[PDB]
From a paper:
Type IA topoisomerases (TopoIAs) are present in all living organisms. They resolve DNA/RNA catenanes, knots and supercoils by breaking and rejoining single-stranded DNA/RNA segments and allowing the passage of another nucleic acid segment through the break. Topoisomerase III-β (TOP3B), the only RNA topoisomerase in metazoans, promotes R-loop disassembly and translation of mRNAs. We present a series of cryo-EM structures of human TOP3B with its cofactor TDRD3 during cleavage and rejoining of DNA or RNA, thus elucidating the roles of divalent metal ions and key enzyme residues in each step of the catalytic cycle.
Yet, RNA complexes of TopoIA have not been previously visualized. We obtained RNA pre-cleavage and rejoining complexes of TOP3B. To obtain DNA- and RNA-bound TOP3B prior to cleavage, we substituted the nucleophile Y336, which forms tyrosyl-phosphate covalent bond with cleaved DNA, with a phenylalanine (F), to disable nucleic acid cleavage while preserving the DNA/RNA interactions. We prepared the cryo-EM sample by mixing cTOP3B-Y336F with DNA/RNA gap substrates in equimolar concentrations, and resolved the DNA and RNA complexes at an overall ~3.3 Å resolution revealing rigid components including protein and single-stranded nucleic acid fragments. The backbone and base geometries of ssRNA and ssDNA are similar, with ssRNA establishing more backbone interactions. We observed that in the ssRNA bound to TOP3B structure, the upstream and downstream phosphate groups and bases are closer to the central scissile phosphate than those in ssDNA.
Numbering used by the authors:
A (entry chain B): 1 to 161
B (entry chain A): 0 to 611
RNA sequence: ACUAAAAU
């Protein structure tokens, strides 16, 4: 019930800890892999999961990221438009995502238009990284091929206005 | 004994033109008591019977609304009772022109009246003032036969005037009531607020002793626009953004500057990543070669708003100065009516003749001759407001005739007229897309093929730039250097007169004949100052007034309120509401607002205490 | 000596 469940989480992509896995609602003899994921999409990765990213992603030594991972979005800013008008037609959309595994923060930059992440995407939304993902300086290149939005609400207020 | 039909026009020139057209050249002229309006007599037929025709003029509004009695004196009244206590009467306008007496001595025995007045709300109001001036002195109309007629027209062309005379109608009383309600609202609100503010400020601050602090439903929002622009200027924080430019070379001589598709990166680290990801490359590939034909589109007809905008922008004239120059030109007979509101030419206009009259001027003689030879292009379809034909030249001129500002305005008007019947400017836009490493760049340029109206408006011209090289997909080119440029977001500048006129048009504040008056008024009351480039810089007086209005009740400055009141006025102009009901329901609301303003004046007091 | 619109 423990080792096989951890294997299932690893296969799915999540690299949580044992305490976090048991924290995700796992009623004995009730649910194994689907409901735990269902509640994990709605609970804070910082309070649940374990680190799996390298030690010094932001340093620049890391050149590629391997393995299918899942991370939590903390902030999304349009780096191609000024702060006063965060949305504008002057420049193509380009979002500077901030992502976390619960322990280490990293930054992702969008090359190709991604009609799955927008300025209206709630913080705490989960993004799954598939395949090899390049990092150039301290920034992870994200496109439509290597990013899948899994949704989720982590009980966060508006933090706006 | 044949009867007489009295016809009235809003202008002496309009009356003369209409009488000449309807007379088929058989016109008799006399001068009236006023000395400006004239009387034109000619024989004809009106209702299947011989009848004399007496055409005359009324110089604008016969009467103007004002308070009657002591209430016109400021020291012996409380402005609070200017709302629902002070009686109002229509006294006179330009009393030196005895217009009422002129109409009475002209319509002494007239059996019919045909109101050849302007087809707008002000036209209908003058229709009814002419009616209540002349109807008492007309002969009694026995039987059910109608004795009052109105003619609906837009142009001053022969067949248009003749058919308009053929199909006559009846004046609309609701539109006159709408105009009267608007006049009462504006008079009461503006005179109450201005009296209060002037009597208050002059009694506490000495630097405003001879000043006139004036509030109005049309100048306060005009000042608010400039104050809002000044607020944007004073509350702007510049931001730093980085743009990558790549310079490539193709023919060993020409160097192409390449623009970035992902323009305006606002993070230094991201921009540095893109630079390090691109500059280590010495070859660029070509992906897209777009060669698309497009046409720059010719202008519409010239309305007063566009003429004022262009005069303020390029000609360097104020709105009131431009209006005065246009009025002088129109009176001298060189330009059509300059207070037109229409961008659409009449379906029956002598465009070819107007161009032919401009066929002996060295600036555009060749262009006019070629256009007449190849046939004029039909003017663009616009908006027909049924007010007046658009501003068009009517007589040839030269610098030796007009001179200076009048010549410049005439030149712009006739160049616009030649352009609006010319061909479109066809230009090929060529874009080449380059790949440098993993990043994209584009290079765009334009090459003209048919100048069209560009020949007569050189300033709406596509710039002359070298044609892009003939490189197809897959061609490789050497890139010299790829550099990152640091730039800052420039702050917006103060409102220009053209932009303010555009905002007034958009929000319905002011009219075609009141925009220059409002701009000049807010300039003369020392609310704004005209700087270099016709920029309206708000003064401390304007800033304190608008900011205090926002603190107390912002609804007195917001542009939308004038539009809302205008909507409620059209409610009775269409007959869907009651004149007295709407009048009272607006007056009481504004009276409550004024009382709140009086009780809460400490806001503006403490806001002005710091700056005088 | 106001407000807003027509007029030369
Ligand atoms: Mn008129
Ligand atoms: Mn008008």
């Amino acid at each position: 019930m423990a080792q096989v469940a951890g294997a299932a989480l690893s296969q799915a992509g999540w690299y949580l800890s044992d305490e976090g896995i048991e924290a995700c609602t796992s009623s004995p003899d009730k649910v194994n892999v689907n409901d735990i994921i269902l509640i994990a999409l709605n609970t804070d990765l910082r309070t649940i999961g374990k680190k799996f990213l390298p030690s010094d992603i932001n340093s620049g030594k890391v050149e590629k990221l391997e393995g299918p991972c899942v991370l939590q979005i903390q902030k999304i800013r349009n780096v191609a438009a000024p702060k006063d008008n965060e949305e504008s037609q002057a420049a193509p959309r380009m979002l500077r995502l901030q992502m976390t595994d619960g322990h280490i923060s990293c930054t992702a930059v969008e090359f190709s238009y991604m009609s799955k992440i927008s300025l209206n995407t709630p913080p705490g939304t989960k993004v799954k990284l598939s395949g090899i993902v390049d990092i150039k300086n301290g920034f992870l290149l994200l496109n439509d091929s290597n990013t899948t939005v899994l949704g989720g609400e982590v009980e966060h207020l508006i933090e706006k206005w | 004994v044949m009867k007489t039909v009295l016809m009235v026009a809003e202008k002496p020139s309009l009356a003369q033109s209409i009488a000449k057209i309807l007379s088929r050249g058989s016109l008799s002229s006399h001068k009236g008591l006023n000395g400006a309006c004239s009387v034109h007599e000619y024989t004809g037929t009106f209702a299947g019977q011989p009848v004399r025709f007496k055409m005359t003029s009324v110089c604008g509004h016969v009467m103007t609304l004002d308070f009657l009695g002591k209430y016109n004196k400021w020291d012996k009244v409380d402005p609070a009772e200017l709302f629902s206590q002070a009686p109002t009467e229509k006294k006179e306008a330009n009393p030196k022109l005895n217009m009422v007496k002129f109409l009475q001595v002209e319509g002494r025995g007239c059996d019919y009246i045909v109101l050849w007045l302007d087809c707008d709300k002000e036209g209908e109001n003058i229709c009814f003032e002419v009616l209540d001036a002349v109807l008492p002195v007309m002969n009694k109309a026995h039987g059910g036969e109608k004795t009052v007629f109105r003619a609906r027209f837009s142009s001053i062309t022969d067949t248009d005037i003749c058919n308009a005379m053929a199909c006559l109608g009846e004046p609309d009383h609701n539109e006159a009531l709408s105009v009267d309600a608007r006049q009462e609202l504006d008079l009461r609100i503006g005179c109450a607020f201005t009296r209060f503010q002037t009597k208050y400020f002059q009694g506490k601050y000495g630097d405003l002793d001879s000043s006139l602090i004036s509030f109005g439903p049309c100048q306060t929002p005009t000042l608010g626009f400039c104050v809002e622009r000044h607020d944007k200027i004073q509350s702007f924080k510049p931001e730093t953004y980085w743009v990558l430019q790549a310079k490539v070379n193709t023919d060993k001589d020409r160097s192409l500057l390449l623009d970035w598709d992902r323009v305006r990166v606002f993070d230094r680290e991201i921009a540095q990543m893109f630079l390090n990801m691109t500059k280590l490359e010495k070859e660029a590939q070509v992906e897209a070669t777009s060669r698309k034909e497009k046409a720059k589109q010719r202008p519409l007809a010239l309305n007063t708003v566009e003429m004022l905008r262009v005069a303020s922008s390029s000609l360097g004239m104020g709105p009131q100065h431009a209006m005065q120059t246009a009025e002088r030109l129109y009176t001298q007979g060189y330009i059509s009516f300059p207070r037109t509101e229409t961008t659409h030419y009449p379906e029956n206009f002598d465009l070819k003749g107007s161009l032919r009259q401009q066929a002996n001027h060295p600036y555009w003689a060749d262009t006019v001759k070629r256009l007449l030879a190849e046939g004029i292009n039909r003017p663009r379809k616009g908006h027909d407001a049924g007010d007046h034909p658009p501003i068009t030249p009517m007589k040839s001129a030269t610098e030796a005739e007009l001179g200076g500002d009048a010549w410049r305005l005439y030149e712009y008007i006739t160049r616009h007229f030649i352009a609006t019947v010319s061909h479109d400017c066809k230009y090929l836009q060529s874009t080449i897309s380059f790949r440098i490493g993993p990043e994209l760049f584009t290079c765009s340029g334009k090459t003209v093929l048919s100048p069209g109206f560009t020949e007569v408006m050189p300033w709406q011209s596509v710039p002359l730039e070298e044609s892009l090289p003939t490189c197809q997909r897959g061609d490789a080119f050497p890139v010299g250097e790829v550099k990152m440029l640091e730039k800052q977001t420039n702050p917006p500048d103060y409102l220009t007169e053209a932009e303010l006129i555009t905002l007034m048009e958009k929000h319905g504040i002011g009219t075609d004949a009141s925009i220059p008056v409002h701009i000049n008024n807010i300039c003369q009351r020392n609310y704004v100052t005209v700087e270099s480039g016709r920029r309206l810089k708000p003064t401390n007086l304007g800033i304190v007034l608008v900011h205090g209005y926002y603190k107390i009740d912002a609804e007195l400055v917001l542009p939308t309120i004038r539009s809302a009141v205008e909507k409620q006025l059209n409610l009775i102009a269409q007959g869907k509401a009651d004149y007295r009901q709407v009048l009272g329901h607006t007056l009481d609301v504004f009276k409550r607002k004024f009382h709140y303003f009086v009780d809460s004046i400490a806001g503006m007091d403490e806001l002005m205490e710091v700056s005088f």
